[PDB]
């Protein structure tokens, strides 16, 4: 993660703004539609379109990602509880983190056409990759 990558990610996520929860919910909906095998991790969830539970979970994921952007240099310490949760309580297959990263990138590309330059695309891709490695680091 280079300083230019940090600057690109910070600019892109700041330009995301207050739509973070909506973007997280849309990314989760895209993941559920494109890769239905990821739906098995949410057996008690109502996973229909416009679901309040999906909206709340997307808000939670978006706030976690905002914290990670605020703590790029301290991601392992900032995401420690989430990493413990995902690795020990949930035992999420590491491939689904790639799937969610792709769906988040697709949501960002669809909502921010001007911001999604190739350099910003690469910076966001590696930022989401690093978040995924932190969340899978307790394996």
């Amino acid at each position: 993660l280079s300083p230019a990558d940090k600057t690109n990610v910070k600019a892109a996520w700041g330009k995301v703004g207050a739509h973070a929860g909506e973007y997280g919910a849309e990314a989760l909906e895209r993941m559920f539609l494109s890769f239905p095998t990821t739906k098995t991790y949410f057996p008690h969830f109502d996973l229909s379109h416009g679901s309040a539970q999906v909206k709340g979970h997307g808000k939670k994921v978006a706030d976690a990602l905002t914290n990670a952007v605020a703590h790029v240099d301290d991601m392992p310490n900032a995401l420690s509880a989430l990493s413990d949760l995902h690795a020990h309580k949930l035992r999420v297959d590491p491939v689904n983190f790639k799937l969610l990263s792709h769906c988040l990138l697709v949501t960002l590309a669809a909502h921010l056409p001007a911001e999604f330059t190739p350099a910003v695309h690469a910076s966001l891709d590696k930022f989401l990759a690093s978040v995924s490695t932190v969340l899978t680091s307790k394996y």
Partner: protein
């Protein structure tokens, strides 16, 4: 497999797509985001900076060829294995491209389509195109199977 509604949506979104810029952008974005894929395109000239990658005429023309192959695969959604047999031989026996890069390029293409079409690239349209690109990648990797 694609339902008739998914096929109709995929074809409708495809007619809007430019056949001269989308594939070059997808190849260029692949080369920028996954820079180990530059090892296969050493004869394409300067590739050091993202601006140099996206300003490359060779990258543009090769992306045009790749987009044409994707269009051919889309016109034969029920015969993907037979459509990409020669390309599968070319990619596996001659170039030794790992099949993971095929899914990487399909995902970059999905991102390019989302970036171009915005709110019109709905999650159902994305799911249909994910099925399409997964089928294309599987067909192109068939010679390794």
């Amino acid at each position: 497999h694609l339902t008739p509604e998914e096929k109709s949506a995929v074809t409708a979104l495809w007619g809007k797509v430019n056949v001269d810029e989308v594939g070059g952008e997808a190849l260029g974005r692949l080369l920028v985001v996954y820079p180990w894929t530059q090892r296969f395109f050493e004869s394409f000239g300067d590739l050091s900076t993202p601006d140099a990658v996206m300003g490359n005429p060779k990258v543009k023309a090769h992306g045009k060829k790749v987009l044409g192959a994707f269009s051919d695969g889309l016109a034969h959604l029920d015969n993907l294995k037979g459509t990409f047999a020669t390309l599968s031989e070319l990619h596996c026996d001659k170039l030794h491209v790992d099949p993971e890069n095929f899914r990487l390029l399909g995902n970059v293409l999905v991102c390019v389509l989302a970036h171009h079409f915005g709110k019109e690239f709905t999650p159902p349209v994305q799911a249909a195109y994910q099925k399409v690109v997964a089928g294309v990648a599987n067909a192109l990797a068939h010679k390794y199977h």
